[model samples]
Target chain A: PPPIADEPLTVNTGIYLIECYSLDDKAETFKVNAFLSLSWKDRRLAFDPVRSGVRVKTYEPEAIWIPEIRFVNVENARDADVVDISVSPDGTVQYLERFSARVLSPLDFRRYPFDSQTLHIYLIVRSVDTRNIVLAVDLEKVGKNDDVFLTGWDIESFTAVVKPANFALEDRLESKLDYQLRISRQYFSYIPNIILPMLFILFISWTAFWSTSYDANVTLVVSTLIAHIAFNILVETNLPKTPYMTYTGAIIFMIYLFYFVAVIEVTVQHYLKVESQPARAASITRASRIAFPVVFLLANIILAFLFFGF
Target chain B: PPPIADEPLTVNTGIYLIECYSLDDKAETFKVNAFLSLSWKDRRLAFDPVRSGVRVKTYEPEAIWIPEIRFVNVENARDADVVDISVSPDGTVQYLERFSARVLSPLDFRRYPFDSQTLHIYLIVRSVDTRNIVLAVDLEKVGKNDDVFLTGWDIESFTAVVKPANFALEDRLESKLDYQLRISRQYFSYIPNIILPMLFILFISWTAFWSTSYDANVTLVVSTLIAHIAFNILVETNLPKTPYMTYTGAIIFMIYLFYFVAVIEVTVQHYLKVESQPARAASITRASRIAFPVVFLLANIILAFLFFGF
Candidate 1:
């Protein structure tokens, strides 16, 4: 009742993205337009093509044994359709399908804006066992458009791997194919949106160290601190859920640290002057004016290295 | 070929938690050891019991038309077993099943830690069409144990609601029963673990305003800032992913504001002293010594009311 094969069927697979929308780590889902291709050789259906190169769509996909490749992490499939079909004179049949789906992708946010993530498309044989079928990816055939890009992310690389089914209860190994798409976040956007404004606030907070009026210094520093909180909240709300500290989180912490230091600088200078040590107080204030920016800049540089540098 | 039902069967359902663990909002999954009870009136199956209460297992589940109840969001089921089966002499048949499964529970962490959450046991009748079967939870029968408490959370209340399935495409309504277990996080644990240390550090940073030595003030304030940062990281790491700021985050911002004010105070006092206004500088210093603590305490009281008070 089943069609017998002399050897394991070899299937070629390729993936290209048309568009990628929001990638929500909290929900573990991503919206994307994906194009997939599968090709296989069947000697039983050998035919000559009218063109010298290849024959396209000579038969429907249902007529041949098509490996069941599924988007395992798909929570919702919005749209899917067969795009094209091609056949070679040597009995090679190719099928192309395109779909827009909300697929699941696990994200690691340890570095957040500086983090690189791998999105996966899992495939396996549904009808036949792994022993009778094998999956492969041809690098030469795999292609992606340069014009298409996800917001805040850049395409890094694409990879494919075949591994045995992890949940199979059978003694014999069942193979599963995985297509991995790697993307890296763009950090440049945050510099203007969060970092620059935060730095300006920190600088204004430090101005208290040089000001003569206690009331002025107090007002300026306190307002600056409030502004920093607003910025921190704004940045935090935009981020997805991650267990570990992110580069953005670390930077906000640094800003808080600088704010606290500036508070101490002003307090100590006043204490020294009140104790009848004007010269000493002046020297300390002067030292802080130079030291604050240097130290803050240095700390941020080190943070950048830890999160972004190779 | 499919079995048909004459009328709509009312299926009673109840949930009891044996153990609930690892309720991860980011993953949207929870590990739970749960007991589910389902009972229905079957006029066809009536038996006499030796005891005054009821007969037990007069017929197997398959012998009668049993409504299928499936866990809608189960991620991974570890174990499931039939705990008990019984039949009332009045023709009420009951089945109890216990299962340990990683079930899906979508969580909104907008006010995390101070946030209350509801874990749901979604049930629907399977095998039979919705037109032939409906699910219900008896308020008196549904229960949870007092001893069963989840870490970092306290039982708030338990409630159940019956509604039509929103996702059903057909014009006919499909009955779905949801057992909602409401819980609130115990912020007492954080008070000792994170809040107390942070408050202590803020107090220490305030000492910079009192100290006579400029270096001592700087050292005390900067180190206190560092300590606050350490405590902040500790608190943040424990929180789930949320778009909004938590009470803890707001408190930390308050601490930074106070620190900056102290810096301004010291600097201004020093400026006054340098300008030969010893009396004014001394007056300002004494005023701050009392004013800072009072203002800080008042701000914290306001923050507490905003976050925790209903």
Candidate 2:
């Protein structure tokens, strides 16, 4: 059967390179090309034949790509290695660039709905069939206009799926990056459900000011504390554990602690009011007046530092 | 070899029934017969039947035997459309008193190695071919008094092993009550690891009042807010989504709103200071001093009402 022109196909593409170093102070680089498939838009963009091609583009949600070369000695350039490149269902080589005798493909094109596709680039070195050396490769996400946002050395596991997750780093580094992105998206989902409601709770707590009874304030604070505990449980049940503090975690902790402090303050203030020590109550009130915003701002800073490694 | 005379086979006997009810009001109630086994130390003095070659004694974990049927409203019960019961190897049964039923085994009792040896219940119901109903069974953790702490359902899953999950109501009903109990002695293992740290974070927030800085106070409030958000994500990710607010969600909302009101107070005080209105700041401070406790108390009350349904 002739191939359908516009049927959509799922494609998976991952390119990673590894460097091996030897005792002789030399290095060789081998690139790992994972499964790559051709996909098409189910619906054609336009009826025009010339302008209507499958507009393929790379997905770059978090621009995290790095390119680097470990160690390729200058002397080994000519006699070092020559590699053979093979491709199943050989397609026309649109463009190719070589650096340090390493070939870089220029968006090699393939047809859609391939059962499987494999690209093999074999390298042959004269002196080093047995010689030890190191190899390095660059990883970059190519988006529209060849715009590459993230670039780094070494490649993590890249399964051709919705998005690739990079876990080849120290725990702190991994979590820091993970949290940053997680927070950015999470903030959107959380604001309406968590942040907004929390703000409302804070406002309700402020009503304690209008009441004459210290007992009322104590009750309110305790109730809020219980509420905080409940929220803590709800959130705890949903999220994965991380060594680093998350923005949400920090916020909840702050509220719980505030209620506790309020408890103490309420007790002390009540005693002052009873003893006719309006002066003492007045002073503490003044202190609280100055405290709230300052603490919140400071919390933001600390949170930023924790999440961003400041 | 007649039954060994030294260690007699203790007959720990009880009776149980499998009841099935349909969601629709027009359905009929179905029943299946079953037997329960119990274990306990022999408390009464042994009676030696040397003359008759027979021995008798009373067993403690005292025994109670109740007939399967007491009152007959069988057709009326079937108006609820009860189905037949199928005996499964991985099933759990409970003890019912009056109209209420209490768990006699852990939901995931099969997971507990002790349960396999301790629980020796079997169904002697009509053949499955004759009855159209299926038995829903689960093993649960029961207290010494046969009060269930946790229960896992779904005894007949085609899958080879149970995956770690939150085991919400849907899962409970779907699993047909077949659950393995945890054998590990660590009770804390039952809870997810993230919970401990979240609690610690809340503890830190509670101590926020110790910080002298006004900024620290605000930071504490905001930090707790963030913490609650983190917890929100954690819980939501794992638990089934329900329209009703969870205990944890309610708390986060309460605390966040409470602190939000405090933020307003702090801001107002800062504005007064900025305007060089010392008298105004002083007055506002005094009012806030009196108000904070009362409002906080009110917040708690409202929160409690929401969480506990007043």
Candidate 3:
């Protein structure tokens, strides 16, 4: 069969997410149940619903020239169903489809628990060129507030935009619609699960500096270091692999370094004591007792500023 | 028209990459130009290209019943040209196509500069059921060495394996062939660009312990800390976002913490000097001159072991 010539087609798309759950950090994918409504003008298929005294009419999608569009980032799609179809008197056709899909979105985990992510749905027209077709979203209908929510995150905003496809050939300016959902991570759980426990361990390790016996201090510091390494491994296993440091990683490294310093401080104090300079040893110990916490707190403030400035 | 009934088709695919470049860490995409050769036995239509001494043939891909195969992770495809087609005496047909495309591969940068990555090309039959079309790779020719090399990376090995598509529906076990290229990062440049300068700064910071006056030690240590922070920002800006610490990040944090300890050591020594305990202050400073370097070296050994060893 000969290829058909390009025809002008305008597609209006709306996305309403019912629920967003199953965000896997390691896989960098999320699951959502969404209703997608697409509308277009088909002059040849015009129907006079008004003359028939009907506000709208419905038909099977397979019987019409539905635009061949696909979600570019969707990894798995399931439970797809044609929810509704409506045609008004003026040849405007709207078709609604609902599905649950696993979508792949690259995430920036630099700020981690303090990070805000924009989950995106990249829609591309597979069977048409930009010269033959265009894409748009009904602003009022797109992401209409229906109390949609995602656990462990707060919905900040939603936006729909049409732009040229990123990976298209230079000669072809293919249009693609991007649906963005901005969400901020809620860190209330992390404070108790990761932060507070780590802080307590740091305080315990700092207490070693005040101890007079070198053996006791060394044991405490070494044990604390081991505990921290365990905690770090546990946290790391759940995160997606990345190249740069996160806020949590910075804090963990800080604690590990402090523990190392405490070991050195103990060693220095022991050396001073062996030299019969008890006065000097005591002075160093006293200074560390005060200095450790002050420096730790100060460094944390700086880290917080670097990661998420007040 | 109704869909065609499923028919048994065996596809043998081979990939020979001519050039691979434009590996974007942030985007997790890499571009490659490769020749993809597919051979399949078509009993329905066969021609003897070999007997006729025609070594090569040509045909429009869409004009024949070419298997609907596609790269599962290809983000963008370009310059796709069907270079050759050939038919064997025994109902076997082979097709060769060349294309440059951007492929999305999930990367594990847990070790950042020291990490190994596996780049994958997932191929699947788009329109055929797995039961009808089984995909296989020509292992001997799949990644025939063409002296392919990536900058800042070392090619370790290549493997082609068959697996079920990850997102297949329950009723279907869609077969997909995965072509994997394993590569390890070469950190030769980082030693000079990041590590060596950092080590020099750290040693300079350690020199503060040798200073006799608190004013000199404080100034040196504080300045070193600022310089280290600047270096950290410079290095961090070039890396991808991650939630785990990198070897460089750990080293940077260690340097920062050591600077903090030096500042505290100076404050303690100054207090003793103000109290007229000149001998004790001098003794502490002398011990630190040796202790600081010893501890820093020992800590680094431990950090290296943690990051790279068992």
Candidate 4:
């Protein structure tokens, strides 16, 4: 029979993570294994300990009326194996089960590489009886294992909001729980492979400022320009192409301007000398030596402040 | 008397946070208020419910032999007040207290602004009698309040590991539990205030490419260089000096090169024109118009890829 109590029946729920991994930014999903625990009071199951000769009794899923709890954010039907069920002398039922599933949580990559994400796993239960059924979080039961770690990422913490969100859906009242997994990127690998190498290549391109040969100047700027393009193309492959540019986006756009300007200085220097104005070409070369490095440094300060700090 | 049952007594422990705040990155500490819940069983405290007339009896701390539980990561002796003590007919003891403390957890600044941290709180108990008392986590009681938040940060989750670390300390067995709070920085404020403003200045400096007047060129690059320098100085003030450069550091260093090169080009254009070589000066100026924008764009692309992507 449905609960005749004036208030909706409160089903206590919790999740304890056993293993969490496979944080795929591109796929925007993470896989997890955890224990799902549920509890509720039912007078129908009450028994006198004197007659039963037991304080708590265990039951199988086949013999019990367990609540149908489901995951809302899961990619597919979760694999769950009911572990055990215990009934207290007062008829409070405790249900324990293990479930493994890939949960879909959308990711924001605007500040990637230096990004942190709070992934969510939504737990839900539909109201099946004439009276609405409510859900609750038992704080003690919401946590994660210590050994949980994701490769190339730092595992932060796993927790759930204490209050369940109740809303009407499909003409029925539904309750939802927000389980979160917080994480951030590990940036050490990007330093040597991408940061320093690009810096080295950039300095090589600027060598035209110190040299005077048009042939060498053209060779230096164009060759390095190609290298810069290669880096840009490599970078483009990693992003999902957001509507807005990222921290790296601003700098990538800036580099193209730098290369185009460098070519201008070289071309200007060559044309002047060919016009029988060695004096003018020499003056341009000397001034370029001053102008090129200064403007580059100043612009860098701007980029630095814009992306990293105050 | 110490247990002669040939086995150590196990004390189940848990923490339920009521509030969490005061995340001091400089001191590497955070403050929190929580309920410290503990459970243990002693047959001596058992009673027959038929004779006692009660299922559970409430007792004062002074009337019970409560275990001495302490925090290992606390900045000072925690402020704890006993709330209640309950003894069940089966001899199970339940102790609850409210405690507030500042916990010390080391932080790493290798990557700031885009960094994540897992702060820890260690709960410990000492072996008092011949029977070594061990600690445990009641996963159900391990959680944080839903409203837990830190200024300028994203509060991820609060949780604890299930297993306890037991080891010999001071000639006695010590059991410890690792409680964790994970958090990440909020990067929304940096976008408009620091990043885009710095970007505006850079584009302003690059406007020299379209101008031929040495007076305007010198004025534009120099004034903008000053602004860029001001920004660098401002950025430096906010960061704790670390051994290595940050993402902003690399770009700040790169900007110096850009500014220096810009100055050189301006000086070269002026000197060539003054040397009475109008043809050469004109050629140099025209080519620079092309080189300035191209090289600038190319260099920005390099910076973008190196920092944000593959």
| lDDT for residue B4 in candidate 4, whole number 0-100 | 28
DockQ category of candidate 4: incorrect
Predicted model 2 interface RMSD: 23.5
- After TM-score superposition, what is the CA distance of residue B270 in candidate 3 from its true location, in Å? 40
Recovered share of real interface contacts in candidate 1: 0.02
**Top candidate (DockQ):** 1
lDDT of each: 0.64, 0.33, 0.66, 0.69
- The full ranking of all candidates by DockQ, starting with the best, is 1, 3, 4, 2
Identify the candidate with maximal lDDT. Answer: 4
Give the DockQ (2 decimals) of all models.
Answer: 0.06, 0.01, 0.05, 0.02
Is 1 or 2 the stronger prediction by DockQ?
1
Q: Could you tell me which 10 consecutive residues in candidate 1 chain B have the lowest summed lDDT? A: B164-173
lDDT of 4 by residue, B33-138 (tens): 8889888776677889998778888888867766667676554457899998988877888888999987666565545556678988877675644344546565
The candidates' interface RMSDs, in order, read: 11.3, 23.5, 13.2, 14.2
lDDT of 2 at A187: 29
| Model 4 chain B worst lDDT window (10 residues) | B236-245
Tell me the TM-score of each prediction against the true structure. 0.56, 0.29, 0.57, 0.51
- Residue B140 local lDDT, model 4: 39
How many residue pairs clash in all the candidates, one count each? 6, 116, 0, 74
For TM-score, candidate 2 versus 4, the one ahead is: 4
> Mind giving the per-residue lDDT tens digits that candidate 4 earns over A106-150?
876756657778888887877766434545555535457565545
